[PDB]
């Protein structure tokens, strides 16, 4: 019992817990599992379902574990016959008005109500009266409603208020006819809307895209990561046969607590549409079916003409570390350094890791006292990250934004909308500057928009001036963070997928362009007489402008490495097999390397991973975020002349995400995302 | 966490009384008599995470759970559709064996089994689950605390107004 | 005997794609996949039974909550090729239509016992 | 057209403009309708049957639906809200597809 820890007795066994735990927390620590319906770790305590009732010797009547504070020397009985009888009675009251909809309920194999009925309930009923009836209302394109099945927990309301922050759902009514939902006809607007479906214990809120399509026992679950954004949300992809049926989050307190954004949750629909299955080589009749050998022969004849920087590579949002290291090694062997990323921040320095990663971990942002957001709309860029910023706002942190006025869930101080306001703030003329200086844990978050700006160098220099003046980086706390909107950006910077000195010094019109999943390239990137090789898994703007199309696997079909905005290296698994005559991307690049006459050393996936470990040691540490030495100041001292060379632009710091639901090829193919976009635009 | 106090008692006791003789890694795989290309397959040793739909902790590695929860799983291979009836066809002999039957109490047990058969394995530890509520809603009392909007300002009082 | 999917007297199929009969099938002879229909009903886009894998236990008739699947009174269903013994939703519905009255009488009699 | 249309629900037991839960069956073959996937003929579909049946007036704000006339020879007992229902917009039994509507909420 060191200081804060106390001792409690649960079923006659000693458990040492902190003072701030409740009875349910100590019972979980004791290995006893209490029946719960409305209690949730990350939501406010409610106490309404009354299924957690246990016995305290001191208390005369049973108490709710979730809301009862534990005390020193408290004895907790969870197996007394009175508790068993109370559990059975509460279960009866829960089931008397429940609809007999188990065969038609999509929660059939995954219902808490059924399982706790079997375990903690009687096998028979005594209710013969009329049950209650509710009329369902539309909550949007993604949420299906069966309010008759609704047990009046408050998880959806508590989530919509505390976490999502749209505050749309509430319990309207009194007594038995009390109902949950918007009183008006309203559609749930948050991009975290899908989480209420998982939070709903009794299937009253269900997924409309995943409606009547499968049962839980039929699905094989593979634990992988979400490439929708640079958060790298941990997910579980459920598959029947060769089809992905649904995507649900996984617990990782480091990155995604247990929440998933709507785009990641519902973009699996676009994984069945506009798919590339076979190699395509262009002719007078257009792109046509070809074998792998013929496409490689055409690529060989094309590369033979080009030389040096005439070969150009553009990596996409969804390219993985292994394919990028493969393409990098192949094009350096050919003799090219024209390796750029599609985003538009191609020339961003990869020299020091602290410059382009979130040095404060996502988890450690909880301890922030004052937060500054520069040129970022964290809602669109990463909804779960905005949820965590909402959590820190709830604690009492003061948040300032130096970009455009956006509808963040929390309230914030609008410091300014243009670069000059950040310039003034860095110089030290600001009340928010005196708040940043005063705070013990100051955090500055710079968005990806600043990175994709023609004047990124001096804006970053101003941000570094603010870092040094306000001391956000100190011993034991690094408060400089850069949030990324793409998964492949941090990995590309880490491996060194940056234009070489010659490419920047002497721009050369590209004669052959290799697109590694890049469907968002700027049109000036390809000289319009170049020979374009598109490697990817959906047909989009990239494939249309390709002389040769090489099919590749998707994130659900390959075991690949991605780096987070915090730089934590995470890996995908093969949930479903590869479609048609498509191959893993690194294998495609290595086969092309053999064909063209520059054979690459690696011939297996572990060898590729070893090459990644050589280029960047942290890639060996999968699942662990590696700290960055604070070298950002020496870098800006190094680039003195260049930052002076950088000019001023007539643009205001704002997000580059026009529409959140469609940002990549998979989302653009998705029908569900299109319906969401149409609903928002009406 | 206390004790199952059932047949599992004698099960564990049979475990601790008895032991297995040490052999070189991979030697037993030859005794097994299965095709040797089976051991060319790679192994992932993991514990399933909790399903987001349900709030039960049985499937997780929790002191409540008394069942084996560490699986040996093999990598997924090609699957196709029957031309006549659209059924899912496969050629993988080890498709469902690991998920269905290869359950182990501890990671070292599965690692020992894999090394005994000669399977190369990568062990993935589950993401730690800590049942710690946030400071804003640490308890039920915190819901109705002054933290919501601050201490009530008393400048509205008639004495203070006048 | 021979399996048959049944319809309501209105002509609407009784099946609600609970998929319990596929879970209870000892031989794994039933494969079911479903969707939401345009009206909004939970209906199957596929219901095929392998009669070369069926053991005619009748468990699927026991598990169905809406009496959609029944084993009819017909034992004359030999075929000259195995492909004709792989039934599908249309064939099962036709078999239910052909034997509707007999199945209904048998079910009315059987309801008293269970 | 159907190849680029968003799957939608007519709205008999759903709403006029909702998404339709869809699997990927028939996506390669080119079929995008529920009945096309499983029926290859040109006959009348069961949905055509259920549409032909007309909504039935009832008294009260709740109707007990057993699917068939005998409770133990049809769908499980269901209680359907008749509030805000009319002949044009009737309530539906999810098991059977029968349509109901009542005028009682209008104080009649």
């Amino acid at each position: 019992l060191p200081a804060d820890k106390m001792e409690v007795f649960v079923n006659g066994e000693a458990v040492v817990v902190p003072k701030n735990f409740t009875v349910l927390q100590a019972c979980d620590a004791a290995g006893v599992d209490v029946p719960r319906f409305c209690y949730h770790q990350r939501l406010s305590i409610a106490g309404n379902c009354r299924m957690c009732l246990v016995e305290i010797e001191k208390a005369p009547k049973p108490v709710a574990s979730c809301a009862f504070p534990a005390g020193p020397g408290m004895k907790i009985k969870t197996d007394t016959p009175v508790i068993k009888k109370a559990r059975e009675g509460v279960m009866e009251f829960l089931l008397i008005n429940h609809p007999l909809d188990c065969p038609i309920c999509d929660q059939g194999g995954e219902c808490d109500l059924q399982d706790q009925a079997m375990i903690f309930g009687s096998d028979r009923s005594r209710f013969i009266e009329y049950k209650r009836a509710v009329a369902d209302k539309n909550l949007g394109p993604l949420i299906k409603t069966s309010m008759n099945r609704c047990i009046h927990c408050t998880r959806c309301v508590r989530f919509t208020h505390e976490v999502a922050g749209t505050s749309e759902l509430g319990i309207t009514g009194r007594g038995r006819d009390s109902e949950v939902g918007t009183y008006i006809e309203k559609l749930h607007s948050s991009e975290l809307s899908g989480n209420v479906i998982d939070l709903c214990p009794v299937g009253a809120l269900l997924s409309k895209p995943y409606a009547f399509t499968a049962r839980s026992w039929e699905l094989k679950g593979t634990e992988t990561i979400d490439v929708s954004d640079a958060l790298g949300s941990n997910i579980k992809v459920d598959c029947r046969g060769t089809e992905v049926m649904r995507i649900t989050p996984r617990l990782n307190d480091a990155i995604n607590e247990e929440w998933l954004s709507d785009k990641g949750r519902f973009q699996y629909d676009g994984l069945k549409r506009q798919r590339l299955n076979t190699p395509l080589v262009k002719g007078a009749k257009g792109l046509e079916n070809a074998t792998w050998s013929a496409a490689f022969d055409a690529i060989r004849t094309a590369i033979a003409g080009a030389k040096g920087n005439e070969l150009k590579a553009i990596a996409g949002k969804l390219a993985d570390a292994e394919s990028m290291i493969a393409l990098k090694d192949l094009f350096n062997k050919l003799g090219s350094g024209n390796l750029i990323h599609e985003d538009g921040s191609a020339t961003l320095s990869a020299d020091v890791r602290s410059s382009y990663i979130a040095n404060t971990t996502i988890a450690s942002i909880e301890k922030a006292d004052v937060i500054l957001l520069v040129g970022t709309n964290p809602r669109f860029e990463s909804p779960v990250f905005n949820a965590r910023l909402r959590k820190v706002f709830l604690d009492g942190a003061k948040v300032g934004l130096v970009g455009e006025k956006v509808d963040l869930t929390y309230a914030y101080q609008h410091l300014g909308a243009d670069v000059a306001a950040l310039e003034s703030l860095a110089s030290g003329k600001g009340a928010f500057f005196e708040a940043l200086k005063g705070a013990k844990n100051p955090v500055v978050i710079v968005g990806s928009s600043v990175l994709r700006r023609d004047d990124r160098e001096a804006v970053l220099k101003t941000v570094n001036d603010l870092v040094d003046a306000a001391g956000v980086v100190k011993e034991g706390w690094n408060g400089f963070n850069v949030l990324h909107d793409n998964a492949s950006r941090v990995a590309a910077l880490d491996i060194g997928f940056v234009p070489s000195a010659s490419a920047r010094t002497n721009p050369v019109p590209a004669k052959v362009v290799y697109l590694l999943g890049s469907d968002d390239f700027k049109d000036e990137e390809i000289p319009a007489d170049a020979f374009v090789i598109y490697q990817g898994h959906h047909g989009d703007k990239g494939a249309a402008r390709a002389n040769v199309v090489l099919p590749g696997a998707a994130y659900t079909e390959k075991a690949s490495l991605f780096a987070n905005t915090e730089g934590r290296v995470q890996t995908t698994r093969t949930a479903v097999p590869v479609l048609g005559d498509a191959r893993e991307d690194w294998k495609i690049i290595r086969a092309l390397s053999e064909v063209v006459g520059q054979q690459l050393p690696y011939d297996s996936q572990p060898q590729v991973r070893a090459r990644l470990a050589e280029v960047a040691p942290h890639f060996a540490e999968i699942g662990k975020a590696e700290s960055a030495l604070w070298l950002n100041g020496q870098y800006f001292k190094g680039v003195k002349d260049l930052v002076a060379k950088a000019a001023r632009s007539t643009a205001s710091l704002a997000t580059n995400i026009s529409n959140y639901y469609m940002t990549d090829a998979i989302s653009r193919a998705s029908r569900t995302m299109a319906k969401c976009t149409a609903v928002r635009q009406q | 966490a206390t004790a199952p106090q059932d047949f599992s008692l004698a099960m564990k006791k049979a475990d601790e009384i008895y032991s297995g003789k040490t052999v070189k890694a991979g030697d037993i795989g030859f005794s097994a008599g299965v095709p040797l290309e089976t051991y060319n397959r790679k192994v992932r040793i993991f514990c399933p995470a909790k399903a987001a739909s349900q709030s039960g902790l049985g499937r997780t590695l929790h002191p409540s759970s008394k069942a084996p929860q560490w699986k040996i799983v093999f990598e997924n291979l090609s699957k196709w559709e029957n031309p006549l009836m659209g059924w899912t066809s496969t050629a993988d002999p080890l498709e469902n064996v690991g998920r269905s039957t290869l359950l182990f109490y501890t990671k070292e047990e599965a690692a020992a089994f894999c090394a005994k058969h000669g399977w190369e394995y990568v062990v993935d530890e589950p993401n730690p689950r800590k049942h710690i509520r946030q400071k804003r809603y640490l308890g039920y009392g915190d819901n109705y605390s002054i933290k919501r909007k601050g201490v009530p300002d008393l400048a509205h009082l008639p004495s203070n107004r006048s | 005997g021979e399996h048959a999917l049944r319809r309501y007297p209105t002509g609407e199929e009784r099946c609600i794609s609970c998929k319990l009969c596929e879970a209870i099938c000892p031989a794994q002879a039933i494969t079911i996949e479903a969707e939401e229909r345009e009206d909004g009903s939970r209906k199957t886009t596929r219901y095929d039974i392998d009669m070369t894998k069926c053991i005619y236990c009748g468990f699927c008739q026991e598990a169905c909550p809406v009496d959609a699947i029944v084993e009819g009174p017909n034992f004359e269903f030999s075929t000259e090729t195995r492909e004709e013994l792989l039934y599908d939703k249309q064939k099962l519905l036709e078999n239910g239509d052909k034997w509707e009255q007999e199945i209904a009488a048998n079910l009315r009699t059987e309801s008293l016992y269970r | 057209a159907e190849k680029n249309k968003i799957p939608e629900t007519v709205g008999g037991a759903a709403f006029k403009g909702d998404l339709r839960g869809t699997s990927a069956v028939g996506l390669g073959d080119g079929l995008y309708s529920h009945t096309s996937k499983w029926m290859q003929g040109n006959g009348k579909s069961p949905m055509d049957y259920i549409n032909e049946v007309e909504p039935i007036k009832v008294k009260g704000l709740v109707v007990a639906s057993h699917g068939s006339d005998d409770p133990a020879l049809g769908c499980p007992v269901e209680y359907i809200s008749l509030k805000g229902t009319s002949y044009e917009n009737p309530a539906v039994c999810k098991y059977t597809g029968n349509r109901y509507y009542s005028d009682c909420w209008k104080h009649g």
Binding site: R275, G286, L287 | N82 | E83 | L27, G28, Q40
Partner: peptide, 28 residues
């Protein structure tokens, strides 16, 4: 020779039970 599966050669509209739609290249 009345009933055959929908994937049969005899079936008027033979079915390849592919669950993914494939991109069609632009003309010319």
């Amino acid at each position: 020779e009345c009933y055959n599966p929908k994937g049969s050669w005899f079936n008027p509209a033979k079915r390849n039970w592919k669950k993914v739609e494939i991109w069609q290249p632009p003309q010319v």
